[PDB]
Homo-oligomer: A and B are copies of this chain.
């Protein structure tokens, strides 16, 4: 919706509010089928130039079928070591394992006899929406076979060769993508499922009309957060599972936390201590708690809405937001790391830029027609994106976002000035406020008595 931003001068951090959530909590498994033809290379004294082209494409069709056949034994055998990869495709893997039953292929075979798509109830109680997106069996048996399976193969047609190359192309590219990916691809490509097929797949999913609108206006993100698992190739059918994300958390407030090192600015470069707020990234309200995503690369932002996968998240108490308003609060122990690294750096936020300027570094903010409009002093500062297009830190040039929104500069004393440098734990990798004050109380006790 409307994006706001608050910069906290005391902790060298900023929070971008106003975002809406779209967190994946479920999966929908669809069975995409390709009707195939099994045939044998028949001896024929092929002498017609159109015959040689058909023979070459039939070999490419058979080679694909053969590779897939090898791959059918590997896709259930791949993995098993555990981890995040196996847990992400377990819903689809469970469907692939059911399609290995004798009954099961026939059942989707019978449901797709009259229609291209139909809902099938599998033996494991999973109701899947089955698609038939390519019918190579009917094309090979109706056009290629009568033209080929006579004693004189010289009969042919030039438009039949071009059309067969057109239809067979998708099978070769689906084979190619499944070949180098051991049967599990992500994102789901157009060869794996076209946009018209995906939009038709979304419209028939057992989801609300609001979720149909959401997934149809964010197809690119839906494809990225989806998996395609190769299942089987038996009985004249090629079947693979397309695993679509289900967003069980929608329209809850999200916010992104930006952090930058906060150091003292003494002239003596060796007497400077630093601290940095940890756990930067996306936060979203979720089921009375907060879903925290440490790797912001796992979330996708599309028009002020944040698409994330819950498997890449940590569940934190709602009191974690207190670190943005009062980092010394006792409800939640806010985490910081310490250093003596007085190296300048910048962080482009949603509506501005944080600048940690230290040493002799030249840190400015410029407008391309007006020039330098702000010069950052030693320490941690912030500039809005209004009237600014460039931030320069040292030899590197950053560009601010030109998005609309209000920024609030929350003035405050930098908390690094509250610590005695002679007693400050300078190299804490993953500490907290109470942790640092605990060590400081330990060291201040030995000196006070002796």
Residues of chain A touching chain B, judged by Cβ–Cβ distance below 8 Å, are 3, 16, 25, 49-50, 52-53, 56, 63, 67, 70-71, 74, 77-84, 86-87, 90-91, 93-94, 97, 125, 157-163, 166, 176, 179-180, 182, 187, 189-190, 194-196, 217-221, 223-224, 249, 256, 258, 269-270, 286-287, 289, 291, 296, 299-304, 306, 310-311, 313-317, 333, 335, 339-341, 343-345, 347-350, 359-361, 369, 389, 393-403, 426-432, 434-435, 446
**Docked-complex contact B394 and A289, CB < 8 angstroms:** yes
Q: Tell me whether B163 and A53 are in contact (CB under 8 A).
A: yes
Name which residue of chain B comes closest to A187, CB basis.
B180
Residue of A81, A87, A180, A304 contacting most chain B CB atoms (<10 Å): A81
Cα separation A430 to B157 with both chains bound (whole Å): 71
Nearest chain B residue, comparing its CB with the CB of A180? B187
> What are 8 of the A-B contact pairs (CB < 8 Å)?
A80-B304, A87-B400, A158-B159, A179-B223, A311-B396, A315-B361, A340-B431, A427-B435
Partner of A25, one of B77, B86, B91, B397: B397
- Interfacial chain B residues near A179, Cβ < 8 Å: 190, 195, 220, 223
A87 to B309, CA, bound (A): 25
Cβ of A286: which chain B residues have Cβ within 8 Å of it?
395
In the bound complex, residues from chain B placing their C-beta under 8 Å from that of A369 are 125
Q: Which residues of B contact A349 (CB under 8 A)?
A: 82
From A429, which residue of chain B is reached at the shortest CB distance? B429
The residues of B that contact A403 with a CB separation of less than 8 Å are 80
Chain B neighbourhood of A50, CB < 8 A = 159
What is the minimal beta-carbon distance from A138 to any residue of chain B, in angstroms?
A: 15
List of 4 A-B pairs having minimum Cβ-Cβ separation, nearest first: A315-B394, A90-B399, A77-B303, A49-B159
- Within the complex, the shortest CB–CB distance from A316 to chain B, in Å, comes to 7
Q: Is the CB of B395 within 8 A of A313?
A: yes
CA distance A313 to B343 in the complex (A): 11
A86-B348, A430-B341 given; A395·B289 CB < 8 A: yes
The interface residues of chain B lying within 8 Å CB-to-CB of A63 are 194-196
Q: Which residue of B lies closest to A343 (CB)?
A: B314
Report the nearest B residue to A166, measured CB to CB: B56
* A432 contacts B340, C-beta separation under 8 Å: yes
**Set of chain B residues within 8 Å of A180, measured between Cβ atoms:** 187, 189-190, 220, 223-224
Distance in angstroms between the alpha carbons of A166 and B52 in the assembled complex = 12
Residues of chain B contacted by A344 (CB below 8 angstroms)? 314-315
Inter-subunit contact B317/A84 (CB<8 Å)? no
Cα separation A341 to B279 with both chains bound (whole Å):
12
Which of A258, A394, A395, A446 is most buried by chain B, counting CB atoms within 10 A of its CB?
Answer: A395
Provide the residues of chain B in CB contact with A316, threshold 8 Å. 343
Q: How far is the CB of A7 from chain B (nearest CB, A)?
A: 13
Whether B333 and A395, one on each chain, are in contact in the complex, defined by CB atoms closer than 8 angstroms, is no
- Cα distance A125–B389 when bound, in Å? 15
Query: In the complex, what residues of B have CB within 8 A of residue A389's CB?
Result: 90
Report if A399-B341 is in contact (Cβ < 8 Å); known contacts: A16-B82, A195-B67.
Answer: no
A199 to chain B, nearest CB (A): 10
CA distance A388 to B68 in the complex (A): 32
Known contacts A74-B302, A90-B402, A314-B343, then 6 further A-B pairs from the complex at CB < 8 Å, ordered by chain A residue: A25-B397, A63-B196, A125-B369, A179-B195, A180-B220, A446-B446
Q: Are A317 and B359 in contact (CB under 8 A)?
A: yes
Asked if B396 and A53 make an inter-chain contact with CB atoms under 8 angstroms apart, the answer reads no
By a CB distance below 8 angstroms, the chain B residues around A269 are: 333
With A190-B179, A270-B434, A395-B291 already in contact, the answer to whether A81 and B429 are too (CB < 8 A) is no
> How distant is A352 from chain B, measured CB to nearest CB, in Å?
9
Contact indicator B270/A86 (Cβ below 8 Å) = no
B256–A81 CB distance below 8 A: yes
A81 contact from B190, B296, B393, B426, Cβ within 8 A: B296
Tell me the complex Cα distance, A434–B84, Å. Answer: 33
